[PDB]
C-alpha cells in the first residue's frame, strides 16, 4: 500500500508517494517530466518494505507538484537536488539513500556531493554529467513529443495533457542547450570528485539516449564506485528488468 500527500519545501507543495517501515530510508528521484506515479511503479510496489522506507517525490513542475509550472534556470539540477534533500529532511528522515534515475540520477549526484553527511548510500543510472555534440543530437531529436514513441507518450499525455507536455519538453530541451556553451559542456563534471558515499552506477548497454562513456565518466571519478553493466539494458531498465533491477539495489544498499 501507497500514501500520496504534499509537504511544503522552499516554497512549493511537492508531490510524494511513501510506504514501508524499514529503517534504512530511500528517495527515489524521476527523471525529465517524471514522477513517482509514472517512473517507480515497481519499486514503491516491490522494494522491501521491511528493510526499507521508500519515498518517490515529484521535482516542482513535474507529476503533482503543480503549482507552480516547470521552468529551467542555469542552475535547475542544483534547485531540485535541494529541494529532494529538504523533502526528505521535512519528512524528518535523518540521512536516507538514493535511487536516481537520468536527471534524477544527476539530481542525486548533485544532492550527494553537496549535502554528503546526509547521503548513505546511491544507486543512479541514465545519468550523464556534461553534453558532448553526440548529445546534442540525442536531446534535439526529441524536442518534437509528435515524434516520441506511441508507448512512452500516453503516460505523459494522460498526466499532463498533450500542451504542457509538449511545451515543457520544449523548455527542457532549451535547459540543457545552455550547458553545452558552458566549459567542457558541464552539469556535474566538478561535484562527482566531492561524492563521498558507495555509489552504484547502472547502464543498460542498449540505452538509446546515453552513451556508455557517460556511465563510464561517472564511474572514473565518482571514488569507490562500482559499474554494472546490464546487456539487454535500455534507458528504462528498472521498469523492463525490474526483478533483476530491485534485487541490484536492496543488495546494494544493505
Ligand atoms: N528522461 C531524462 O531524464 C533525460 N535525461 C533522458 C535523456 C538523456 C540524454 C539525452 O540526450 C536526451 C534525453
Ligand atoms: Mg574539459
Ligand atoms: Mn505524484
Same mark, same amino acid.
Given at each position: 500500500? %501507497?500514501?500520496? +500527500?504534499?509537504?511544503?519545501?522552499? $516554497?512549493?507543495?511537492?508531490? #510524494?508517494? =511513501?510506504?514501508?517501515?524499514?529503517?534504512? +530510508?530511500?528517495?527515489?528521484?524521476?527523471?525529465?517530466?517524471?514522477?513517482? /506515479?509514472?517512473?517507480?511503479?515497481? =519499486?514503491?510496489?516491490?522494494?522491501?518494505?521491511?528493510?526499507?522506507?521508500?519515498?518517490?517525490?515529484?521535482?516542482?513542475?513535474?507529476?503533482?507538484?503543480?503549482?507552480?509550472?516547470?521552468?529551467?534556470?542555469?542552475?535547475?539540477?542544483?534547485?531540485?537536488?535541494?529541494?529532494? %534533500?529538504?523533502?526528505?529532511?521535512?519528512?524528518?528522515?535523518?540521512?536516507?539513500?538514493?535511487?536516481?534515475?537520468?536527471? $534524477?540520477?544527476?539530481?542525486?549526484? !548533485?544532492? +550527494?556531493?553537496?549535502?554528503?553527511? #546526509?547521503?548513505?548510500?546511491?544507486?543512479?543510472?541514465?545519468?550523464?554529467?556534461?553534453?558532448? &555534440?553526440?548529445?546534442?543530437?540525442?536531446?534535439?531529436?526529441?524536442?518534437?513529443?509528435?515524434?516520441?514513441?506511441?508507448?512512452? *507518450?500516453?503516460?505523459? /499525455?494522460?498526466?499532463?495533457?498533450?500542451?504542457?507536455?509538449? *511545451?515543457?519538453?520544449?523548455?527542457?530541451?532549451? @535547459? !540543457?542547450? =545552455?550547458?553545452?556553451?558552458?566549459?567542457? @559542456?558541464?552539469?556535474?563534471?566538478?561535484?562527482?570528485?566531492?561524492? =563521498?558515499?558507495?555509489?552504484?552506477?547502472?547502464?543498460?548497454?542498449?540505452?538509446?539516449?546515453?552513451?556508455?562513456?557517460? +556511465?563510464?565518466?561517472?564511474?572514473?571519478?565518482?571514488? $569507490?564506485?562500482?559499474?554494472?553493466?546490464?546487456? /539487454?539494458?535500455?534507458?528504462?531498465?528498472?521498469?523492463?528488468?525490474? &526483478?533483476?533491477?530491485?534485487?541490484?539495489? /536492496?543488495?546494494?544498499?544493505?
Amino acid at each position: 500500500s %501507497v500514501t500520496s +500527500a504534499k509537504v511544503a519545501v522552499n $516554497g512549493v507543495q511537492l508531490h #510524494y508517494q =511513501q510506504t514501508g517501515e524499514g529503517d534504512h +530510508a530511500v528517495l527515489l528521484l524521476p527523471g525529465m517530466l517524471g514522477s513517482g /506515479e509514472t517512473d517507480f511503479g515497481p =519499486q514503491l510496489k516491490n522494494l522491501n518494505k521491511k528493510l526499507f522506507t521508500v519515498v518517490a517525490w515529484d521535482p516542482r513542475g513535474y507529476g503533482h507538484s503543480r503549482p507552480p509550472d516547470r521552468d529551467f534556470p542555469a542552475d535547475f539540477f542544483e534547485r531540485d537536488a535541494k529541494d529532494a %534533500v529538504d523533502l526528505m529532511k521535512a519528512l524528518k528522515f535523518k540521512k536516507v539513500s538514493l535511487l536516481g534515475w537520468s536527471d $534524477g540520477g544527476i539530481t542525486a549526484l !548533485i544532492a +550527494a556531493a553537496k549535502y554528503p553527511s #546526509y547521503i548513505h548510500k546511491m544507486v543512479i543510472w541514465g545519468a550523464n554529467a556534461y553534453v558532448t &555534440d553526440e548529445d546534442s543530437m540525442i536531446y534535439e531529436g526529441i524536442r518534437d513529443v509528435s515524434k516520441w514513441s506511441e508507448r512512452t *507518450r500516453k503516460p505523459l /499525455e494522460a498526466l499532463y495533457g498533450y500542451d504542457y507536455f509538449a *511545451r515543457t519538453c520544449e523548455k527542457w530541451v532549451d @535547459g !540543457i542547450r =545552455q550547458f553545452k556553451h558552458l566549459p567542457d @559542456g558541464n552539469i556535474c563534471r566538478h561535484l562527482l570528485p566531492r561524492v =563521498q558515499c558507495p555509489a552504484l552506477i547502472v547502464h543498460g548497454e542498449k540505452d538509446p539516449l546515453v552513451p556508455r562513456f557517460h +556511465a563510464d565518466f561517472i564511474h572514473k571519478h565518482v571514488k $569507490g564506485s562500482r559499474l554494472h553493466l546490464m546487456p /539487454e539494458g535500455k534507458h528504462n531498465l528498472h521498469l523492463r528488468f525490474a &526483478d533483476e533491477f530491485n534485487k541490484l539495489a /536492496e543488495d546494494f544498499l544493505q
